[PDB]
Design a protein around this ligand. Structure first.
Ligand code: HEM
Ligand SMILES: *[C@@H]1O[C@H](CO)[C@@H](O[C@@H]2O[C@H](CO)[C@@H](O)[C@H](O)[C@H]2NC(C)=O)[C@H](O)[C@H]1NC(C)=O
Ligand SMILES: *[C@@H]1O[C@H](CO)[C@@H](O[C@@H]2O[C@H](CO)[C@@H](O)[C@H](O)[C@H]2NC(C)=O)[C@H](O)[C@H]1NC(C)=O
Ligand SMILES: *[C@@H]1O[C@H](CO)[C@@H](O)[C@H](O)[C@H]1NC(C)=O
Ligand SMILES: *[C@@H]1O[C@H](CO)[C@@H](O)[C@H](O)[C@H]1NC(C)=O
Ligand SMILES: NC(=O)c1cnccn1
Ligand SMILES: NC(=O)c1cnccn1
Ligand SMILES: [Ca+2]
Ligand SMILES: [Zn+2]
Length: 595
């Protein structure tokens, strides 16, 4: 009965089966089904979508329509009563660097992107939603509850537009709405190179046969490269400071400039590609542009995969790492490599790891200048602070020496994100990411908390006392029950993040299962996984095994002192060393001798 499937909007595929390299769109990875994992196709559904009308209306759209007999609470009311807090003191993670939060953002970006629908061009459809808060079509405004401080200073709501969906942009009516993943599902550095041919070419430097990525020609970081500017107007980065008038950066991913430390991470990755390309050129003078670029791109992809699976996932999943991601056993073409719609919400556990401020530190790892520490919100879409205020080095020192925020049942998300988020085209630092996450969860037709608990083989609390035991928190379960009248209605983003973290990890049991299962598939179902026999030669793998985020910093910045385990909390100068005692990536095995 279940159909072969739709996909009118989706592009046609032709595959070079000889190709030793990935496509930019992800197509051709799986040979039997070439479109699996490819960008711009529907996110996978691990469970049937749950919409108010079974097809496309989110729960909460029709006021009179209940979910399981109860009205769903406003996303902003759950944010105000459960997610927010005042005191930032004592909220830091004693054993994770700020780099741990940032890498999580980088990895998410590489894997999934579900952009708001496109209809606002030559239209006030976007202007109206914002200006008048009238719910309709793609406009699904986040209404402020009665006692909300924002009602007094910001109006009746926060604009919010429904995510883009496959086939008709216009709503379909026989089968459940499926949201689109605009990027490639493989952990493949698509955030650096782009997931569309159109964008991938624009990022390259084709003026020279060196396989380099294009760089900024208007500014340099003490001779080091910056990413090219996106000269698209309007620009949110110019808008945050019309006097500095510095635009956003142009990277393989559309969100690169959202916050200063993400732009910073993208810069290091870009520098790495060119550094690898230059190096390869030396060793194999005979290799042309396409060759160099594809080879450096392939090494960068492996670097990202290694740092992620070897350093990052174990300290996220703790004790559950083995359970869900057993040691590698090779490529399995039977595995669905597609990112699931629920994983795009599970991975948002990172939102509770973002601290309230960002620091710039000098070569002594001491405050750099008079305004060295800055509130996070002044840093959304902020490029000028990097270009006109010291480059990226002082920021990278902060990523190593400062701490991530620790998830806390009583202090979930910092007000820098919960009350002062800046959204492009909107003019103010007054949005709420936590509310947007909850409204989105509904937009995507997410099944509720207990459906996912069942999916992960975990208990399904039906009462306040039952929920109290699962969350090991009486007061939190009581607020959740007061808001959602049954655990069955609790949105997965908030339910999953409310659970106490597993041993040696940073997420609860439910998230560990959703995340673990996804990463296992991402690895096992990738024909181009770095450790799959034949992708790299065995000597190349011996060389890749040494990659480290410390080495990445050393080779692409002017920082000469770094920790050996960049993700753990590290203090200067004790946990820091000279870049000379740190393993280098040895590109000797890439010397291809032919004659
Ligand atoms: C200051 C740092 C961060 C900012 C400002 C931020 C901001 C945002 C915003 C504005 C959205 C779009 C929300 C929506 O429209 O539904 C989003 C989505 C998302 N965020 Fe974050 N975020 C940050 C950190 C992170 C971290 C550390 C992680 C992971 C460890 C992460 C994971 C995600 C994921 C998976 C999505 C959904 C992406 C997609 O599939 O569309 N975020 N973030
Ligand atoms: C594309 O690559 C060319 C060649 O590397 C770049 O041109 C040069 O700019 C460098 C700075 O990296 C100068 O030192 C040289 O005068 C030029 N070098 C050569 C070998 O000609 C060009 O800037 C690149 N274009 C973009 C947009 O990145
Ligand atoms: C926007 O960017 C400008 C340009 O850098 C900032 O102006 C600088 O800030 C301090 C003075 O407070 C000085 O260190 C710089 O020399 C200033 N330059 C100039 C030309 O004034 C400005 O503070 C930023 N404004 C906002 C709102 O972010
Ligand atoms: C390959 O993947 C399929 C589908 O997920 C799975 O059932 C099977 O056990 C995997 N094969 C091996 C050898 O693990
Ligand atoms: C600090 O973190 C690392 C993992 O990154 C771990 O090996 C070490 O035991 C941690 N220390 C404590 C006290 O948890
Ligand atoms: N961290 C994120 O996933 C993100 C960052 N900026 C915009 C949208 N999403
Ligand atoms: N924060 C964001 O959603 C974002 C990031 N980059 C470009 C546009 N929007
Ligand atoms: Ca990808
Ligand atoms: Zn310098």
């Amino acid at each position: 009965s279940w159909e072969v499937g739709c996909g009118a909007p989706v592009p046609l595929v032709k595959c070079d089966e000889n190709s030793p390299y990935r496509t930019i769109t992800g197509d051709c990875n799986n040979r039997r089904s070439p479109a699996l994992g490819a960008a711009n196709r529907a996110l996978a559904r691990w469970l049937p979508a749950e919409y108010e009308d079974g097809l496309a209306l989110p729960f909460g759209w029709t006021q009179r329509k209940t979910r399981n007999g109860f009205r769903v609470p406003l996303a902003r009311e759950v944010s105000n009563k459960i997610v927010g807090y005042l005191d930032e003191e004592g909220v830091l993670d004693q054993n994770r660097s700020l780099l741990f939060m940032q890498w999580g953002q980088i990895v998410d970006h590489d894997l999934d992107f579900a952009p708001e629908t496109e209809l606002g061009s030559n239209e006030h459809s976007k202007t109206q939603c914002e200006e008048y808060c009238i719910q309709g079509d793609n406009c699904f405004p986040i209404m402020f509850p009665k006692n909300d401080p924002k009602l007094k200073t910001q109006g009746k709501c926060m604009p919010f537009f429904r995510a883009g969906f496959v086939c008709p942009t216009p709503p379909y009516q026989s089968l459940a709405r499926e949201q689109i993943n605009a990027v490639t599902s493989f952990l493949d550095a698509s955030l650096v190179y782009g997931s569309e041919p159109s964008l991938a070419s624009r990022l390259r430097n084709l003026s020279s046969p060196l396989g380099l990525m294009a760089v900024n020609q208007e500014a340099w970081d003490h001779g080091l490269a910056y990413l090219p500017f996106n000269n698209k107007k309007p620009s949110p980065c110019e808008f945050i400071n019309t006097t500095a008038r510095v635009p956003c950066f142009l990277a393989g991913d559309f969100r690169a400039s959202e916050q200063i430390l993400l732009a910073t991470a993208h810069t290091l990755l870009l520098r790495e590609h060119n550094r690898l390309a230059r190096e390869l050129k030396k060793l194999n003078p005979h290799w042309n542009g396409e060759k160099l670029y594809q080879e450096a791109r392939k090494i960068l992809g492996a670097f990202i995969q290694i740092i992620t699976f070897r350093d990052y996932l174990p300290i996220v999943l703790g004790s559950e790492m083995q359970k869900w991601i057993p040691p590698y056993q090779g490529y399995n073409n039977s595995v669905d490599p597609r990112i699931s719609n629920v994983f795009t919400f599970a991975f948002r556990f990172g939102h509770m790891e973002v601290p309230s401020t960002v620091s710039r530190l000098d070569e002594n790892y001491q405050p750099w200048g008079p305004e060295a520490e800055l509130p996070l919100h002044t840093l959304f879409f902020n490029t000028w602070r990097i270009i006109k205020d010291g480059g990226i080095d002082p920021l990278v020192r902060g990523l190593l020496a400062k701490k991530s925020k620790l998830m806390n049942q009583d202090k979930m998300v910092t007000s820098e994100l919960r009350n002062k988020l800046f959204q492009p085209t909107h003019k103010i630092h007054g949005f709420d990411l936590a509310a947007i996450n909850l409204q989105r969860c509904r937009d995507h037709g997410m099944p509720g908390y207990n459906s996912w608990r069942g999916f992960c083989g975990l208990s399904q609390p039906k009462t306040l006392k039952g929920l109290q035991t699962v969350l090991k928190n009486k007061i939190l379960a009581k607020k959740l029950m007061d808001l959602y009248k049954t655990p069955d209605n609790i949105d997965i983003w908030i339910g999953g993040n409310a659970e106490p973290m597993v041993e040696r990890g940073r997420v609860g049991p439910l998230l560990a299962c959703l995340l673990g299962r996804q990463f296992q598939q991402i690895r096992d179902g990738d024909r181009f996984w770095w450790e799959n026999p034949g992708v790299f030669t065995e000597k190349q793998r011996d060389s890749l095994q040494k990659v480290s985020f410390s080495r990445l910093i050393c080779d692409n910045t002017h920082i000469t002192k770094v920790p050996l385990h960049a993700f753990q909390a590290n203090n200067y100068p004790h946990d820091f060393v000279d870049c000379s005692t740190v393993d280098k990536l040895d590109l000797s095995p890439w010397a291809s001798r032919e004659n």
